[PDB]
Design a protein around this ligand. Structure first.
Ligand SMILES: C[C@@H](O)[C@@H](N)[C@H]1O[C@@H](Sc2ncc(C[C@@H](C(=O)O)[N+](C)(C)C)[nH]2)[C@H](O)[C@@H](O)[C@H]1O
Ligand SMILES: C[C@@H](O)[C@@H](N)[C@H]1O[C@@H](Sc2ncc(C[C@@H](C(=O)O)[N+](C)(C)C)[nH]2)[C@H](O)[C@@H](O)[C@H]1O
Ligand SMILES: C[C@@H](O)[C@@H](N)[C@H]1O[C@@H](Sc2ncc(C[C@@H](C(=O)O)[N+](C)(C)C)[nH]2)[C@H](O)[C@@H](O)[C@H]1O
Ligand SMILES: C[C@@H](O)[C@@H](N)[C@H]1O[C@@H](Sc2ncc(C[C@@H](C(=O)O)[N+](C)(C)C)[nH]2)[C@H](O)[C@@H](O)[C@H]1O
Ligand SMILES: Nc1nc2c(ncn2[C@@H]2O[C@H](COP(=O)(O)OP(=O)(O)O)[C@@H](O)[C@H]2O)c(=O)[nH]1
Ligand SMILES: Nc1nc2c(ncn2[C@@H]2O[C@H](COP(=O)(O)OP(=O)(O)O)[C@@H](O)[C@H]2O)c(=O)[nH]1
Ligand SMILES: Nc1nc2c(ncn2[C@@H]2O[C@H](COP(=O)(O)OP(=O)(O)O)[C@@H](O)[C@H]2O)c(=O)[nH]1
Ligand SMILES: Nc1nc2c(ncn2[C@@H]2O[C@H](COP(=O)(O)OP(=O)(O)O)[C@@H](O)[C@H]2O)c(=O)[nH]1
Lengths: 429, 429, 429, 429
């Protein structure tokens, strides 16, 4: 027989959950059984292995219940949840050389251990933290590395931000570029039209070493379900929301050194936005954003730790003008796809910065409003959105929802990932 | 039920054997079943797990069939032989920062994966390449680190050699010294009288933190069995030895910048001995040793790669006056022990430099001849041995052997480690 | 021709000045000409080199006009100020492996280049980030290294802190310990009794290798002048002090994961101390303390960026009951010294935590109050100050100012460093 | 005023001379004054600063006198020869990560301290050991970094050779590619048409980021002269050359992992091609090459530290019918340039492999023969050289001489780079 294993090496997703990488792992586990079936159809009996850095129960986003949840879920299926030694306190999911080198080593170890017992292995690594893994496996693992195919994904150091990546990130992502060009067993999995281009043109990665791992949402997941107006108003009851004004909603991880989500840009623009109350739902409490909203005399509603139930209500409420997405250069952000789909019938429309994957998601103006990353441009964009006729708005809202169907459907795209990996397994050997 | 695991982390011993670390592993496996028994009596159901850096089939000392034999030994006994990722080509078993950090991460990964399925673990770390394993486990293992006891052995960087150790070596041993002092779950396991005192005052390791892992041999193993006169000459025959002349023998690994066996000392000293032929059997052919043999034009037999069949025959021939161990800072050499035991009845007696553990092996003169590490004192020693009468020689031969029996037996010394280990498992929860 | 250089490798002091290390450099420069004359009496002409990492202008404590004042000061005595490349972005004066390694390389470069132009060097190195410097000069600097004497000072990795020191800090401080025992040209510079003893016993460092660099304050500086009661009040008037209440004062750098100043302990004790007003002049503003004070409902006053003229005023007021010093493990804090000296006439008495150099500073209870590091012990400590008779208070006050004169005069103490260095330089050829 | 500085960071060239890098530094300092005068005519007083690792006096290639000559040469001219801290003992001029990071850090420091006292600096970085100088200066230097143009040359890790480079090499050559794409103050100095092409299709480096540093030989140096056939056999004398009648010379270095020189194909096709008489060489005696020699049946001379005076003559005698250079992919080999120039009246005709910069040297067949790597191809090429036509090999011998004159003049090419660099110092403020 042939027994197949996906090794998912992810910096978050079981113990800790804050962003898209954790959400990718969550989407992964829900689609698992179906993918297993699909692959069985293609001759492979497939097991799932998950590797995530060991975390201190004190880390932002820790949740032991989730951990057990994921561990039990993979175990019943025949897979493992494994916590990998990084060489850190466990109190963060990122670092510099010593954190990357350790986590890569144990990541590569888990890939080879799994390959001893399997017939083939597809090792999906993500983030600069795991980027040295294909080079570590292909350089040293002999007969067992001939069983492994690498797909590396979620971020390569680029020149598309003002903040220059750390030497540690520059080095690890250059390592994986080298190995993608050097080993036919090592591919990049691009997540977006923007990174397939950028990684080809910054790192000289040939077309045959680029596999599709395109960002997507599982549209029919319950958390995206459409809501009646009674439940919408019930759900935002205790959000502290004003009774007057329309909303521009934003949410995500707090911008911190290194990644500039664009929240301050909405706050700057609310100064010249007379009917507009920004609602910024950040993951952790953000004392800094509050300091701005007061320095600008802007009456912002600042939330933290919101469930998606409340965020889904806000986006669906007829009081909500737009959801803004203002990141400096998102490689493959999925929050807009959720907005476009949760607001199928009612609520927000998307305002999307003109950088990273955002223009692709809003179809360059067709399914949403694109804006330059200046306060005046964001203020302009909101006015633009307000000036839309209800005939205009209803076909922009439809066009957005149609796109999430066509391009951003998680089961379609993870099948696109699985299918390419499996097909490539039958040509490298 | 409380399942115990010994995790053995060793730089060689399955894929590759050249020195005493690999002899440790070989002795360990051959003794495993009798340790199951002792530990069974103390209520522990013990299991052996072995971790060795991944090696390229092209490396010095590789052997695919030893590796398959060790792998099966452990697997039949419910344990595991695990090849470990380092950040290397796998062609050598040592390195700089990069090799030490990857191996210590993956060794720590293997300790933690093993605590996941066992009730306690004693992790025996060996050499600077695994010196960081205690802190990697004791900083991030959380509750899994709470069921692990660390014994780090086979070297701490010292100032007893000419070669100043690598900045990587100083870091790794400096790290494990720190953790030995900081955590009641991390101990240095000393391998000799000399090492136990030296590390104690070099690193301020408190006596409670020192554990016995004293070097020793399995005296009643076949390879040390005694030989008929007839059989001795059959083996001596094919090595090309001079028809006349007394023999002084040395064997071990080729000298290299980190380790100075005294091979050069014998050749320099050789001219001052009239009718002595030096026989020097190093692991791999030594072109450099030939050159002082031609400089002093001393008559010498330079063998490479001998089986212990032929080595034993040499150490037992009446044509052999002494075996020489002239290492500069041997921490815990077992070759003298092998010599004092392979020759309880006939043949060589041992010449030991007065540095490292050798004075302890010879009982400071009472079981051998101690010499300074100069070309002159070595000859003085050869001479002294010459002038021993059968009253003094037979007496010196017995003392040495009794000494092995009482201080350097493996079964007793590995149970001292095992007993010390288990005792320390209690007293820490 | 005997030209002598002191090379000062300090993590702050010229571009950036937040804490005691920067206090050191300032004291060094002011004492320079007085010191130069002392060394002129003893046969050397002296020159000062200062080596400080490169710093981005948007950084905590970055004063462009101080860098210029330091640069001109040194160059006018034929000296130099040099900024050193670390492999960092210049925003903070700290890091991990990458930071310590680059800074020590470029620091070791600055010593050797100086040793090319001078006949003798004393190279006084700063924190963990400069600890690799001795082994870097002495392993590779040949004849130039033979002209250098190293004094390493300001804190090693210890087990006196709940925060387990960073692998970078363990590895680096292990390294200089090795080199202290390896070369008579490498010495450790102790700054307190605590430091000395601790090093000797934890790091196994011989008494021959300990050189005095005991922390101290230049008590004739005008910034320690006794303030006249009209002048305290006018200075105090801006701070927002309540009209009632008696003050317990504190000031220093904001606490951070590396280092624990007890600011949150004083707020905790005030929960049991009605009428006591904590006055915590922190370096940057501390939102965390304000949230704490709000939660505990204690009437603390939280200042930031306070000048020492204003701090001196609080310390001298009759309204101020004590100054508190509550650091987890202060190696050689001069801040207690600053209090005991400024309040020689009138004002606070010192409450000192029983760890680090603090008990020695208050002479084990004969010069201030010594307390454990708990909320309740600290609240207890305040009372014992309050119940001291005005009689006993005058006795304490005079003793503390006596002790600064005897034990913590800066000028006497650097002389003691200089003489120890010159002596050691003579001794080793 | 405006003083310009060329800081040359080279792994060898003054203290140690073993390879083409040392040759580049040798030719450089000879043309210093011929560039000092040129650069004045563009308005710059230029100073030359040379940086090199601290070497141990016992290292291969060490010469205390060469280092004293270079130091004084530069000092005479207002420059410096600076020895650079690396994190090794200095016995090798290479390493993995300690070495590259420390060497690049002190290199960047050297550039920056030169940038401080100059108005503009052209920092020419050497191989992977200095690849990180460009980015350590452009991230932390700040103001002084805006006065520096970085030209990194002599090798980027690529995929042409069978050899996979070290992770340390990949990381540093990844780092410099990143800064080269990112900063207009960072350029790669290309040494061949082949290297310029390769760096763009492997590192996505645009030609706009290149500057010429094209590999060249100093034609007018006395060693390159033609001389008498009397001198031919006087310089043949003192060398044990069997006189079969003719030769196919292939001098070079070891054919080992990383640097295959292709001697094997020759040996093979030759011993097979009727009546051809191969000869070879080395730089230090190659015993495995001696092995290959004893292995087949054709003459081979083990040339050991043979001066340039001897080796030129070997190529020029009418016995030599051909010289072959069959490297793996030599990025910018200068020896075929040495062959074509030396045998311009009397000597050999150059045979080149079709890999690396070699087809550029021999003008794609007009000025030499170009042959695929395989030994049946090597036979076919040496077939068209023992067969030599008057209107053919007089016309190609003169093509080869004209090629070195047109493309590979060292005086021409360092001028090209200096002008290119000064030009690009404009266009960046
Ligand atoms: C399915 C999609 O949701 C998925 N492709 C997403 O992956 C992430 S990858 C990432 N996560 C953390 C980091 C480290 C990084 C950071 O925190 O930003 N920093 C620690 C270095 C700053 N990089 C993307 O951020 C996101 O846009 C999106 O592409
Ligand atoms: C059972 C006994 O035989 C056992 N205790 C033995 O352990 C070894 S420990 C060691 N092995 C390799 C190194 C590194 C070292 C090397 O390879 O030599 N170098 C890589 C730095 C050069 N250190 C001792 O050498 C030996 O004496 C003896 O104590
Ligand atoms: C003249 C005297 O003031 C002098 N002896 C003082 O030196 C300093 S040394 C130091 N400063 C910063 C660090 C790094 C450390 C930290 O910030 O705390 N962390 C970055 C690792 C956390 N170490 C002492 O702090 C102080 O007590 C006192 O000894
Ligand atoms: C003037 C010309 O001669 C000049 N451009 C030459 O520069 C050298 S650069 C180089 N030399 C040694 C190494 C490292 C290498 C080694 O030592 O072999 N290894 C340590 C990585 C193995 N890289 C080229 O080799 C050569 O072709 C030629 O371009
Ligand atoms: N409920 C909730 N979900 C969040 C919050 N912040 C982020 N998420 C989820 O995390 C995912 C992050 O998507 P993405 O745009 O890729 O974020 P990024 O990875 O940080 O760039 C989204 O699908 C969100 O649903 C939050 O505050 N509350
Ligand atoms: N058969 C054989 N065994 C060897 C040879 N060289 C070393 N050994 C074995 O390797 C072991 C090394 O023991 P030890 O004295 O500690 O050497 P060390 O570990 O290198 O310091 C000994 O038990 C020897 O039996 C050899 O050439 N032949
Ligand atoms: N003016 C002023 N000086 C400060 C402040 N915080 C710290 N300092 C100075 O920084 C120095 C720190 O001394 P020390 O006790 O060694 O602090 P430490 O290094 O953090 O342990 C003291 O001399 C203070 O004068 C502040 O908020 N204002
Ligand atoms: N005198 C002498 N010079 C040599 C010898 N081998 C190489 N060289 C010099 O070293 C340079 C090597 O050039 P190159 O082809 O680039 O060598 P590479 O850098 O190792 O590829 C040549 O210009 C020679 O002048 C030798 O055996 N003797």
């Amino acid at each position: 027989g042939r027994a197949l294993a996906f090794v998912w090496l992810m910096v978050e997703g079981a113990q800790v959950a804050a962003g898209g990488v954790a959400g990718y792992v969550r989407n992964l586990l829900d689609e698992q059984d179906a993918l297993r079936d699909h692959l069985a159809e293609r001759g492979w009996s497939v097991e799932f292995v998950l590797g995530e850095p060991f975390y201190d129960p004190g880390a932002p986003g820790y949740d032991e219940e989730r951990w057990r949840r994921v561990r039990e879920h993979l175990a019943a299926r025949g897979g493992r949840a494994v916590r990998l030694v990084s060489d850190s306190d466990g109190l963060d999911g990122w670092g510099e050389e010593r954190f990357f080198h350790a986590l890569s080593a144990t990541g590569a170890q888990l890939v080879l251990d799994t390959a001893e017992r399997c017939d083939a292995v597809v090792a999906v690594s993500g983030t600069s933290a795991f980027a040295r893994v294909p080079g570590m496996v292909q350089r040293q693992g002999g007969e067992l590395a001939a069983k492994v195919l690498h797909v590396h994904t979620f971020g390569l150091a680029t020149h598309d931000t003002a903040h220059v990546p750390s030497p540690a990130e520059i080095a690890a992502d250059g390592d994986v570029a080298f190995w993608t060009r050097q080993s036919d067993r090592v591919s990049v999995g691009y997540i977006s039209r923007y990174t397939a281009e950028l990684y080809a043109r910054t790192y000289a990665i040939p077309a045959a070493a680029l596999l599709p791992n395109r960002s997507a949402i599982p549209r029919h997941a319950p958390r995206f379900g459409v809501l009646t107006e009674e439940r919408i108003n019930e759900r935002i009851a205790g959000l502290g929301l004003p009774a007057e004004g329309e909303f521009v909603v934003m949410w995500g991880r707090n911008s911190a050194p290194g990644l500039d989500k664009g929240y301050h840009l909405l706050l700057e623009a609310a100064r010249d936005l007379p009917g507009v109350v920004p609602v910024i739902a950040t993951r952790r409490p953000d004392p800094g954003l509050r300091r701005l909203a007061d320095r600008y005399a802007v009456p912002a509603v600042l939330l933290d730790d919101q469930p998606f139930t409340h965020l889904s209500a806000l986006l669906q409420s007829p009081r909500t003008l737009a959801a803004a997405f203002l990141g400096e250069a998102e490689p493959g952000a999925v929050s807009p796809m959720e907005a476009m789909w949760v607001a199928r019938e009612s609520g927000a429309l998307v305002i999307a910065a003109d950088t990273g994957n955002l223009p692709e998601v809003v179809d360059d103006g067709a399914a949403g409003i694109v804006t330059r990353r200046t306060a005046a441009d964001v203020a302009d964009a909101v006015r633009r959105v307000r000036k839309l006729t209800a005939d205009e708005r209803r076909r922009m809202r439809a066009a957005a929802a149609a796109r999430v169907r066509a391009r951003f459907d998680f089961a379609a795209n993870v099948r696109e990932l699985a299918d390419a990996a499996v097909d490539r397994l039958a040509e490298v050997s």
